[PDB]
Design a protein around this ligand. Structure first.
Ligand SMILES: [Mg+2]
Lengths: 295, 131, 415
RNA sequence: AAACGGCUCUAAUCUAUUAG
DNA sequence: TAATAGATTAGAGCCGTTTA
């Protein structure tokens, strides 16, 4: 179960871009279920298959497949159970207009069993590291620091964030919640709701259909019917529409896959993946902090 | 009877400064931003896995077909889209002929020896896991 | 005469012209470009003349800033003007403005009359417009380039600005019991008795009994609560709780909100216990489905709820829970519950999962929406709403029609 | 572990209350 | 310490490959 995680963990001390392919993936036709069709029926997606692989092959080889279209740093932090470990991912725009997406690593450890939040010291260190990375990449501190996570931020860690955050810098807290039971159908057509529509529940909380039907591919990014993702602006001040736009923009940079977009902001997804990599094996000082070594 | 707002789909940049919504379409039309010259592939695994990887790579070079080509864009081929060479003849191979820990250790030590001792440079290592 | 000519500035604009020519050959059109097709060790100007005035359907001129004033581009354009006059063909010259810096009014005097195919932004859409222009003039293997054509056309089909209406899984709570009544059964309720087993919903809160029912509903199984003074019970106008107004030391607003929510889901459970629907225990809640043969042609109204597939039987079931954050509304979650003979459940859950994914492989939005609406309308005793029993005289009323939504942006349904 | 999705299962935590 | 809920959160796995 932890083969991929441990293998990626043990190659972090010496930076080696690695990608794991099983024979059932590369040659799916050869391996059958012994009573009929192959176990993984990849014919419907074969080209897509190759796409993804090539994308991954082109990403870990130091090639940038596509950037995103300032002054805002998107920090998505995800918590992993083992005590909990918080692992981050940062995406921002520099003066060179090349989107820097490296991902803050060196997970911050909360000793509490079920508390998926950071202590003032760990939160202070995390946001200080984010600011330092943004400064060394851009030569200035960010106008807006887009903190977002799968959990809401407690008052104490938010106060720690505000204490260590610099002046003339407004940082916001955003919660992405998946699998909320809001199954919004379509009564006229036979296809589900088209992606991009947003239900503004409140000036701080909204339901964003980051995934759904899409006219460009004449289909839906998912099977079944699409579950909108809950965007909660629990901390900070920001317009809900701009936050939804930022989530939609972050759903674009999934370099680990060749798909139109994914249902969650991929900053959280990549932070989660590097979190599994970190929790796989023994702690490594100054982790690589680049997705080509984890994803 | 609530209002549902629309967020315009953001466009991701591509080569020549062009913007397309779908990464697949933008890659197929204009190509990736930066031009690496090729992929120095390293394959660590069983001879069967190496052969499967070479066959799939050669299949990657030529265009390949989806079942439904309109819901999901074509793959023209690695040279056509990304403009870098990843042929299968330039593959650096490493043969392999608590259980989780030692299985992990075998591939890790093979990759370590290949990265430290071998002269040939490998850009990315494709661990071909036996099934 | 079957050929396409593209003139451009050579030192600067090569990537655009190379890409355009490659796409054009991919589309099947024959092209001639000086950086691609002009041979080495050959009189270049003589061959340009031969191609321009001998074999050329159309003459495309990039309208970049440098490509406008360039002497070579000007010479090719002049010969193209002469062959345009000779051939009498309309729109033989096609400018392609690709630079945003130069104005449409600063285009050189020989081109400004022609309508320039826009290429300044989104070369893909400009190429689609150029392709449409080529098709309209009938400018001169079939199954391999229509894919590139359809990808060119489909790269930009932004949402049509049309009105669309949507049904949801949120069924609003139309009405609510006026009073939430806590009954002080310090001894009348045994301390070891389960408050979930009462015929009407009730929760053990403090020394009181949180329920929407009267103090004398719990008599059949709890007879000792008789002769209990009504002044002991504390009744709260729950509209204040829904609005959040009621925030006292006795109970916080969120706590009583949660209490009412719990009352809602367990009254839901009790009602489906009396609504002739079987139950399945998932990880976190109960799903309620209809057996085979209990409905006419296995369908309610014109929507089926139970069917067969591969020696297996499927029932559409619902699991509901209330939330009062934006409004008091009960969300439903739809599932497919599986059986061998149609009445007897499968003990295994892996086969249930596999069958659920196999049946949902072909289920789409219309099927799920119609199944949900039919099942909820079936559980409706009232024509336009369903009942949840919380007391003999206090009632929970749930809208049959989901919270309706609408959008100014939508799509053309695929055919 | 190409990948994303729906789905299922389990567990934990925070609140509020009750019995040890 | 145990229980009963809601709310949140986290983990895993399992099947399809997104109706033309
Ligand atoms: Mg990956």
């Amino acid at each position: 179960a932890q083969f991929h995680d441990q293998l990626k963990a043990r190659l972090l001390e010496h930076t080696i871009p690695t990608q794991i392919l099983r024979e059932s993936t590369l040659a799916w036709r050869d391996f059958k279920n012994t009573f009929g069709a192959p176990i993984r029926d990849f014919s419907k997606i074969e080209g897509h298959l190759a796409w993804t692989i090539s994308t991954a092959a082109y990403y870990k080889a130091g090639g940038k497949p596509w950037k995103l279209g300032p002054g805002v740093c998107y920090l998505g932090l995800v918590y992993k159970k083992i005590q909990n470990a918080c692992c981050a991912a940062q995406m921002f725009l520099d003066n060179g207009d090349g989107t820097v997406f490296k991902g803050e690593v060196g997970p911050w450890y909360n000793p509490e069993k079920g508390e998926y939040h950071l202590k003032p010291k760990e939160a202070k260190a995390l946001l200080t590291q984010a600011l330092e990375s943004y400064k060394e990449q851009n030569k200035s501190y960010p106008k807006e620091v887009f903190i977002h996570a799968r959990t809401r931020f407690n008052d104490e860690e938010w106060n720690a964030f505000n204490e260590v955050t610099p002046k003339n810098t407004n940082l916001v807290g955003v919660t992405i919640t998946k699998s909320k039971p809001l199954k919004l159908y379509k009564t006229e057509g036979a296809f589900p709701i088209m992606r991009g529509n947003a239900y503004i529940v409140d000036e701080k909380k909204a339901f964003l259909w980051t995934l759904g039907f899409v006219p460009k591919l004449q289909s839906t990014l998912s099977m079944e019917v699409p579950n909108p993702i809950f965007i909660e602006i629990n901390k900070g001040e920001a317009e809900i529409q701009q936050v939804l736009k930022d989530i939609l923009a972050l759903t674009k940079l999934n370099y680990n896959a060749c798909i139109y977009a994914d249902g969650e902001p991929v900053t959280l997804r990549f932070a989660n993946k590097i979190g599994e990599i970190l929790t796989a094996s023994t702690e490594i000082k100054t982790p690589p902090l680049a997705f080509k070594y984890y994803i | 009877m609530k209002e549902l707002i629309y967020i315009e789909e953001p466009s991701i940049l591509f080569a020549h400064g062009q913007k397309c919504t779908d990464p697949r379409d933008g890659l197929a039309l204009f190509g990736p931003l930066n031009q690496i010259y090729g992929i120095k592939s390293g394959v660590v695994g069983t001879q069967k896995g190496l052969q499967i990887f070479k066959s799939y790579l050669d299949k990657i070079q030529k265009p390949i077909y989806n079942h439904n080509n309109i819901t999901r864009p074509m793959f023209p081929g690695f040279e056509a889209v990304f403009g870098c060479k990843w042929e299968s003849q330039n593959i650096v191979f490493k043969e392999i002929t608590k259980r989780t820990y030692d299985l992990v250790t075998l591939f890790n030590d093979k990759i370590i020896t290949a990265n430290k001792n071998d002269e040939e440079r490998v850009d990315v290592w494709f661990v071909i896991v036996p099934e | 005469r079957n050929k396409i000519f593209i003139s451009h500035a050579t030192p600067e604009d090569d990537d655009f012209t190379r890409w355009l020519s490659l796409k054009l050959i991919g589309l099947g059109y024959e092209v001639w470009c000086d950086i691609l097709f002009l041979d080495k060790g050959v009189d270049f100007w003589s061959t340009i003349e031969k191609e321009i005035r001998e074999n050329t359907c159309k003459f495309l001129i990039v309208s970049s800033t440098a490509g406008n004033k360039r002497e070579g581009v000007l010479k090719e354009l002049a010969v193209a003007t002469k062959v345009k006059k000779h051939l009498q063909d309309d729109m033989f010259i096609i400018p392609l403005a690709i630079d945003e810096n130069l104005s449409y009014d600063d285009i050189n005097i020989e081109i400004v009359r022609l309508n320039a195919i826009d290429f300044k932004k989104s070369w893909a859409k400009g190429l689609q417009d150029l392709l449409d222009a080529f098709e309209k003039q009938n400018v001169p293997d079939h199954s391999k380039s229509n894919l590139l054509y359809q990808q060119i056309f489909l790269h930009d089909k932004q949402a049509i600005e049309k009105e669309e209406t949507y049904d949801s899984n949120w069924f609003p709570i139309i009405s609510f019991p006026n009073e939430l009544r806590f009954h002080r059964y310090d001894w009348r309720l045994p301390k070891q008795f389960d408050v979930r087993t009462l015929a009407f919903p009730a929760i053990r809160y403090k020394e009181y009994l949180c329920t929407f029912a009267w103090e004398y509903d719990f008599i059949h199984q709890l007879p000792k609560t008789e002769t209990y003074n009504g002044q002991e019970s504390i009744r709260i106008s729950t509209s204040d709780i829904l609005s959040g107004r009621y925030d006292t030391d006795f109970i916080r607003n969120y706590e009583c909100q949660r209490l009412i929510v719990q009352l809602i889901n367990k009254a839901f459970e009790l009602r489906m216990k009396d609504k002739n629907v079987r139950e399945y225990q998932m990880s976190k809640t109960f799903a309620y489905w209809i057996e085979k043969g209990k409905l006419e042609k296995d369908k309610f109204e014109k929507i089926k709820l139970v069917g067969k597939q591969k020696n297996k039987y499927w029932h559409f079931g619902i699991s509901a829970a209330g939330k009062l954050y934006p409004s008091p509304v009960l969300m439903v979650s739809s599932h497919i519950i599986f059986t061998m003979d149609g009445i007897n459940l499968i003990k295994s859950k892996s086969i249930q999962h596999s069958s659920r994914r196999k049946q949902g492989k072909n289920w789409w939005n219309d099927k799920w929406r119609e199944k949900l609406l039919a099942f909820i309308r079936f559980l409706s005793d009232d024509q336009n709403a369903i009942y949840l029993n919380v007391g003999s005289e206090e009632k929970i009323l749930i809208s049959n029609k989901p919270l309706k939504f609408f959008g100014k942006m939508s799509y053309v349904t695929p055919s």
